[PDB]
Amino acid sequence: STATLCLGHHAVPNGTLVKTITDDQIEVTNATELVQSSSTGKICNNPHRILDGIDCTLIDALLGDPHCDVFQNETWDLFVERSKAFSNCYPYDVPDYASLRS
Amino acid sequence: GLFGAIAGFIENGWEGMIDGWYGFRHQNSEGTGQAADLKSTQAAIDQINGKLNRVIEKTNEKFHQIEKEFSEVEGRIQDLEKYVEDTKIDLWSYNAELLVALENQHTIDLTDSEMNKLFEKTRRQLRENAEEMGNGCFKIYHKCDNACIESIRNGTYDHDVYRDEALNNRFQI
Amino acid sequence: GLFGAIAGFIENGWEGMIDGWYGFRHQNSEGTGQAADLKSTQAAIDQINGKLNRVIEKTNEKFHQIEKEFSEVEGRIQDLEKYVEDTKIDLWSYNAELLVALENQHTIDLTDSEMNKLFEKTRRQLRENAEEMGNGCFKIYHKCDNACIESIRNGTYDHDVYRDEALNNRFQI
Amino acid sequence: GLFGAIAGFIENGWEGMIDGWYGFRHQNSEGTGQAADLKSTQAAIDQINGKLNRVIEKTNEKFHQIEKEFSEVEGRIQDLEKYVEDTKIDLWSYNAELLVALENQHTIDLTDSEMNKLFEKTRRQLRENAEEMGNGCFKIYHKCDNACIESIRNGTYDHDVYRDEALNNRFQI
Amino acid sequence: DTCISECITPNGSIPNDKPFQNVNKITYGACPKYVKQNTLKLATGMRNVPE
Ligand SMILES: *[C@@H]1O[C@H](CO)[C@@H](O)[C@H](O)[C@H]1NC(C)=O
Ligand SMILES: *[C@@H]1O[C@H](CO)[C@@H](O)[C@H](O)[C@H]1NC(C)=O
Ligand SMILES: *[C@@H]1O[C@H](CO)[C@@H](O)[C@H](O)[C@H]1NC(C)=O
Ligand SMILES: *[C@@H]1O[C@H](CO)[C@@H](O)[C@H](O)[C@H]1NC(C)=O
Ligand SMILES: *[C@@H]1O[C@H](CO)[C@@H](O)[C@H](O)[C@H]1NC(C)=O
């Protein structure tokens, strides 16, 4: 005589709140994170040629401060200057250090 | 959402349906069963994966730019340099926010739409042989064993084959 | 909008309905009356107030920036300073424009959607006891006094209780 | 799109209908014919031309700005000048991309909506005198010559005038 | 470190699988645009109405 047919959709025990145009937080069955918020703390030597500046800034390696001569004729994709890099030669100053360095 | 099926006329979802997104549940003479509808389930999936690709597409890729952190105070140029970056971050932070709110709204309506389309289609198959109970379930006014349900589910149900039986039970027995 | 109810199959609105956004008007044996549907009315309101909050949210908040008005002509830096602000204002002026056009379109469709949902739901309650006159009004084919209308309005109307009466009048009396 | 009519329950389109966007095809006693519905066709057109105007509206219009091509290397200022333009082009290139993707999605749904509205309206005219074959075609259960079809098409078809005839053929002849 | 990454920031390398990042506005390579938000979940599913 009769039969019942019911249409429906899935649900998960624990969903994920998301934001939409009209709702601050609305629960959905799944979501993906769009914002990368963490790093390992290490810089990778591949695929970009990274030159570790050790105790030298680019300028002192450019001019030739004795302790930076280890960087003669070097090439890089990204030069990494350290906060504690120091000069140990004749006191100098560069008018427009920013642009020379750039 | 815009449609009314999901979190609408379909009271709630089935925590148990783990084989598809949208599905059917029947209760005939032989008993009760459940089956996911692979077709509508894949329409929602395809569309969602489609926006996913658009969104997480191909990266900025910048090399030498301008300085963003300063150790000494210099005034004028440094002021402008910082403002340039600041107003930039601000504009990209808005874009990201809005983009995510629009997409989310659409993903909901879209998935609400695929539910409501499964319903109308299934509704259009049953012709005069059924009535809608108003909860997403159709009352089929004729004997419908499992092979009968399967034909509805697989889209081959012929309504003439049960019309008169249906009509009879429907209209005052 | 996308639905067809508002400024669509519902010829026009009721200047008189001042107690809700969506509502009912009946005409039975006892007479005529009107009543707002607080439920759908609040769904539209909630959603609209929801975007309103998102939009008029929390302010820029900038302090020392860069100069935007100049008394002397200087060239190069001043050129760049002005261009930076100009291209900024331009990008924010587009965002504001588009944002307001998208929201407005959505607010219309959304409110058109809540009308059309009130209709389908009410339609699904009446079962076989009514027909749609095509103007947003259902012709109820059975005696329906005020307590009968109230049950439709409050969602408790049982269709079996009037089915045969309904069916009879419907199908050639 | 969101509706299901276009590239949905209406199997495909008519390469032959060159007089309108949406239309009708009937088959009665007198034969077969075709006619575009100028009303729904113009609703889609108006809306599309409406966004078209918004989009291709009024131009940037900039005069003296800043330099974007450089012959000598200078550092700091030149760095910032280039970054300013670069981040600008990037932000406008996103806007253009997104704008075109949103509009396109909407144009589809909107035109899918006007199809589905033509259907429901025509469906609401036929009252109990027809059934939906599930392919966008209504089976009219009564003699309907050309002047009868024309009245449906032009919105003047009275269903009472054929109800009993209709009802009879419908319900077991 | 001896690893592989195309996106470098003062803080270390970060994967560029996502389109946005909130690690540092200073980056070199193929990198996620920087934004102020620490999270932005994109809904990859339908609404969840549990039983
Ligand atoms: C959630 O969606 C993401 C993106 O499509 C996917 O990685 C994952 O499989 C989904 N989660 C589940 C539980 O399926
Ligand atoms: C639909 O159901 C019937 C009953 O089981 C079967 O014979 C028919 O071939 C099915 N069609 C498909 C495509 O599965
Ligand atoms: C609905 O209508 C009937 C008639 O007035 C009444 O008895 C019933 O309790 C009403 N329900 C609600 C929730 O108001
Ligand atoms: C609709 O169809 C009938 C039959 O041809 C005709 O008399 C009637 O006036 C038509 N109305 C319009 C507006 O064309
Ligand atoms: C990255 O570095 C800056 C300082 O270099 C710090 O303020 C920020 O919170 C750091 N982000 C992460 C994820 O460590």
Q: Which of B135, B130, B116, B153 is nearest to D9 (CA)?
A: B116
Rounded CA separation D138/B167 (Å):
19
Tokens standing for residue B159: 């309504």
Flag whether C touches E (3+ CB pairs, 8 A cutoff): no
Question: Determination technique for this PDB entry?
Answer: X-ray
Contacts of residue D76, Cβ cutoff 8 Å, sequence gap at least 6: A96, A98, A99, A102, B77
Tokens standing for residue C69: 């008005």
Q: Which of B83, C78, B81, B87 is nearest to D64 (CA)?
A: C78
CA D163 to chain centre: 33
Rounded CA separation C130/C152 (Å):
12
- Among B156, B158, B162, say which to mutate for ligand 2: greatest number of ligand atoms within 8 Å of CB: B156
Query: Which residue has the CA at smallest separation from atom 8 of ligand 2?
Result: B151
Tokens standing for residue E41: 């979940």
On the CB side of B94, how many CA atoms lie within 13 Å of its CA? Answer: 20
Ligand 2 atom closest to B153 (CA):
1
Q: Which of A67, A48, A47 is nearest to A57 (CA)?
A: A67
β-pairing verdict for A3-9 and D138-140: unpaired
CB D167 within 8 A of CB D128: yes
DSSP string, chain B: --SSTBTTTB---BTT--S-SEEEEEE-SS-EEEEE-HHHHHHHHHHHHHHHHHHT-S---B-S------SS---HHHHHHHHHHHHHHHHHHHHHHHHHHHHHHHHHHHHHHHHHHHHHHHHHHHGGGEEE-SSSEEEE-S---HHHHHHHHTT---SGGGHHHHHHHHTT-
Rounded CA separation C160/C164 (Å):
8
Say yes or no: A6 contacts chain E, CB-CB below 8 A.
no
SS (H, E, C) chain C: CCCCCECCCECCCCCCCCCCCCEEEEECCCCEEEEECHHHHHHHHHHHHHHHHHHCCCCCCCCCCCCCCCCCCCCHHHHHHHHHHHHHHHHHHHHHHHHHHHHHHHHHHHHHHHHHHHHHHHHHHHHHHEEECCCCCEEECCCCCHHHHHHHHCCCCCCHHHHHHHHHHHCCC
In angstroms, what CA-CA distances link D144 with A78, C69, D148, D157? Answer: 81, 77, 5, 11
Which 8-state DSSP code applies to residue E4? Answer: B
β-pairing verdict for A78-80 and A50-52: parallel
Say yes or no: A98 contacts chain E, CB-CB below 8 A.
no
Say yes or no: A12 contacts chain E, CB-CB below 8 A.
yes
Run of H or E including A35: strand A35-36
Tell me whether residues B13 and E49 touch, CB distance under 8 A: yes
- Which of the ligands is closest to the CA of residue A35? 5
Cα angle for residues D44, D47, D48 (degrees, 5° grid): 85
Exposure string over A50-88, b if 16+ CB within 10 A, otherwise e = bbebeebbbbbbeeebebbeebeeeeeeebbbeeebebe
Reduced to 3 states (helix: H, G, I; strand: E, B; else coil), residue D24 is: strand
Q: Which amino acid makes up residue D80?
A: L
Say yes or no: A31 contacts chain E, CB-CB below 8 A.
yes
CA A47 to chain centre: 14
CB atoms within 10 A of CB C154: 11
Rounded CA separation C167/D125 (Å):
21
Residues framing ligand 1 (Cβ under 6 A): A 30, 32; B 52; E 44
Rounded CA separation A51/D107 (Å):
52
- Among C122, C148, C152, C154, say which to mutate for ligand 3: greatest number of ligand atoms within 8 Å of CB: C154
Tokens standing for residue C35: 């009543």
**Residue B45: left (phi > 0), alpha (psi -120 to 50), or beta?**
alpha
User: Looking at chain B, how many residues does it have?
Assistant: 173
Run of H or E including E13: strand E12-13
CB atoms within 10 A of CB B169: 18
Tokens standing for residue E9: 């920031």
Which one of A1, A4, A5 would you mutate to disrupt binding with B, by most B Cβ within 10 Å of its Cβ? A5
Rounded CA separation C25/A37 (Å):
56
Rounded CA separation C19/A23 (Å):
25
CB E33 within 8 A of CB B62: no
Domain ranges of chain C: 1-173
Q: Which of D102, D114, D103, D132 is nearest to D3 (CA)?
A: D114
Report the chain A residue with the minimal C-alpha distance to residue C48.
Answer: A22
D76-126 helix and D146-153 helix, angle to the nearest 10 degrees: 140
Site of tokens 């053929």: D169
Contacts of residue A72, Cβ cutoff 8 Å, sequence gap at least 6: A64
Q: Which of B63, B82, C40, E15 is nearest to A102 (CA)?
A: B63
CB atoms within 10 A of CB B109: 23
**Residue B127: left (phi > 0), alpha (psi -120 to 50), or beta?**
left
Cα angle for residues E28, E32, E33 (degrees, 5° grid): 90
Tell me whether residues E41 and A34 touch, CB distance under 8 A: yes
Rounded CA separation B67/B85 (Å):
9
* B139 CA distance to ligand 3 middle (Å): 26
CA C106 to chain centre: 9
Rounded CA separation C107/C103 (Å):
6
Tell me whether residues D74 and A98 touch, CB distance under 8 A: no
* D152 CA distance to ligand 4 middle (Å): 9
Site of tokens 């993903």: B107
Contacts of A34 in chain B (CB under 8 A): 55-56, 96, 100
Classify the C-alpha dihedral D113-B3-B108-B48 as positive or negative: negative
Run of H or E including A63: helix A58-63
CATH class of C1-173: alpha beta
CB A52 within 8 A of CB E8: no
The alpha helices in chain D, defined as continuous H runs, are 38-55, 76-126, 146-153, 163-170
Residues framing ligand 5 (Cβ under 6 A): A 38-39; E 10-11, 23-24
CB C144 within 8 A of CB C156: no
In angstroms, what CA-CA distances link E28 with A48, A88, A102? Answer: 9, 30, 14
State the Rg of chain A over Cα: 29
Rounded CA separation E7/C39 (Å):
52
Q: Is C154 in the pocket of ligand 3 (CB under 6 A)?
A: yes
Say yes or no: D106 contacts chain B, CB-CB below 8 A.
no
Classify the C-alpha dihedral D105-D111-D117-D123 as positive or negative: negative
